[PDB]
Amino acid sequence: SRAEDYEVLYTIGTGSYGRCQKIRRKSDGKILVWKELDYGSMTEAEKQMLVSEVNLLRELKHPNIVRYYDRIIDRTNTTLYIVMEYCEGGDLASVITKGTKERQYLDEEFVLRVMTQLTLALKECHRRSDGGHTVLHRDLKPANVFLDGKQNVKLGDFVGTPYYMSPEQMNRMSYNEKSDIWSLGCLLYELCALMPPFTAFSQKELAGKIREGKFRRIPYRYSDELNEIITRMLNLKDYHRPSVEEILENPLILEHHHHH
């Protein structure tokens, strides 16, 4: 319940909410991380918005979602620490960087595992098994997708250019479930091609490309069937994109893709 219960091992890096550090739980020596949120400048009603959200995501449980463990209020540091699963395998953006550096495309089997596991994770968000509020991820990109020691997917972290920006967002429409699907399409495309489907120097040039809805086929290394399902996620019309249930129905997706 206190910072004292954990020993900071070292600092990993700093992201959206704030800084992230690798830690040891004193009780048993378990390696974890925590995410720091400074609430020092927040009002009480700004805070109220935060406490509901934290609680909702905390009930979220799935083998392909980064596991929540604990929360800590530190008055002295005016910081809220969220303790979560440490993911030994790093993130997917690093996997993609590595492919580019090595000039080696990822195996189709690896892409199908990532598609399968992210879609399972999203399904638990979009359809709580039993049984609470629907959750949209809202920030789905390679840097938010972590990996364990066997490279199973762990979906986490619920001036740059927004490569993955959906047609909805761009048209002043509300982010919905199919907006998560558009982002998954962008991520899987990038996993295959080692580049995002729409690239640009400026945001207005990017918006232009995204509105036109056109992109290269993923590499011929990959089956027509994989190309098809990713291309379907990148449909301009949200109602033409598949639901998580429709993705999982695909003939490509087999039992061994659910876990390495």
Ligand SMILES: NC(=O)c1cccc(Nc2nc(OCC3CCCCC3)c3nc[nH]c3n2)c1
């Ligand atoms: N990106 C890394 O340096 C790295 C390398 C090896 C393992 C990890 N593990 C890791 N990493 C995380 O995020 C660090 C990342 C995201 C926030 C901004 C800084 C970098 C995790 N969040 C929940 N669980 C997490 N596990 C990470």
